[PDB]
Symmetry: D2
Subunit: 155 residues, 4 copies
């Protein structure tokens, strides 16, 4: 007995899908997350080399919600330019959520242009659907999008 | 495999942080034991380190900093699924004369969900020769846009569970 | 099962703590690469978070606090069996002009074994167009009754292993 | 290739072996160790109910050696009044020691008197025997002895 919710975010960028994708899939990116997102993390623990299987423990600055959660780099698909990251411990999972997934899909539009289609799907017990829907947003994915965009839009 | 942890090093508006509304919730457990007996357990400095005993399977981890008297800090981590997952707590007042105890959330828990101040007060008042009310109340200050979110969570539960568990101990010979 | 952690809250003599003897140990790695190339790696603020890469299987856990420039603190935990098991370290000086770097043990490690002060200095000095000496030295202050105990442990190893590992990187095209 | 060393400590006490033994074997004793040894521990983590199987993580105040080690309540023998506690992680095991055991044996002398025979045995690689023998002493056991003694010598 869980309700499924899926939220979406899109971002057009004046760079090739391939260029934006190398950065998203780049295993060194994990240890550079504080560089892309200054002041977003109080503490970031990386278990693994940044490729699939890598777990990230994330604790945020006092006041913010999810104060702390773990994450797993679960899947990568280079041909489709697709990446799935799962919340595995803490955060919304202590708040009636039984499943939490992020999908990032970089789809080309023209020769030197693409969309970043970021989505997150979750499953919540009906009792917690109203407690938790004003909390879960597309924020963390939109932040990844804006940072990667700007870092790559440098000739 | 390779553990690597990275911690780097902006404040909010001076009016924004005080821009709250007070909510007060009460709980009354009237029990058939003297106020003195209930109070001696509540004010017992050894109670902290026996909370796992009193409340089995509530804590995944319990850290206590200090002797157990006023000033003591309790860092409480709860089992996966449960929420508030972790918060710190402080013993503000242990007033024997009035049978009055105050404990405050000082970090984590609802403080990361719009709450700016959170106080438990426990007052044990006589009702007869061998009976008393345990009056537990919690006062919190919330950003009003968060009251919808945080109110179903902030129940009278954890201090109600305390009062019952202490009462049970006493009512046993 | 039940985790329960308890942390409570006396100082030593003012002359006792300064009652040490200085020991200085040197290491010189003269390599066939320019001092500029060796220095750019040593002074590179990204080097901290790539120490697991540079030195595989040395760390069980590496925490870095700060950007990587002066002021940065490194908390290093090593695999079971190895000793110093854990210590904190601080970037005191990164002097481009002199190709001079100082890093200090500020907590743990040999500081719990009679040592009261511990400084690594790395000075990269030219020897020719494409050669230099990496002069690493460590100065520590020990309580003299502990010198027998701590001297076989405090070797020139960890800063010798650094110098070689950096040299290898550079000497590759 | 390890050298075996065994050190001993004895303490006569004007109380019955049985009285001193109830306290040594008392599963609630673990959580009372900071009470017996004020200021000895910076931080004491107890995993378990204080009976056999219990692991204790011990971190000490800056300056002291073993800064931190884990311990296991390995064996109890009530008839012989005997207790064995093993160092399982950290401390001397990061310093060439491959085995570390404490035995506490409370043996009665007269009707209302006993000895506390505390010993510790360790195995060290020959390279580390000289580095580590000025460090390992009977200190932690003698402290247990003096504290338990005095707490029990109260009519």
């Amino acid at each position: 007995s869980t309700v499924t919710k899926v939220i979406h975010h899109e971002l057009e960028v004046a760079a090739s899908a391939d260029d934006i994708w190398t950065v998203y899939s780049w295993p060194g990116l994990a240890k550079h997350l504080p560089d892309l997102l200054p002041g977003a993390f109080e503490k970031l623990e990386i278990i693994g080399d940044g490729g699939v299987g890598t777990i990230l423990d994330m604790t945020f600055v006092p006041g913010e919600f999810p104060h702390e959660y773990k994450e797993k780099f679960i899947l990568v698909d280079n041909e489709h330019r697709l990446k799935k990251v799962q919340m595995i411990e803490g955060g919304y999972l202590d708040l009636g959520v039984t499943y939490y997934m992020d999908t990032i899909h970089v789809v080309p539009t023209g020769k030197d242009s693409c969309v970043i289609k970021s989505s997150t799907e979750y499953h919540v017990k009906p009792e917690f659907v109203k407690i938790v829907e004003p909390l879960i947003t597309t924020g963390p994915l939109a932040a990844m999008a804006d940072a990667i965009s700007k870092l790559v839009l440098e000739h």
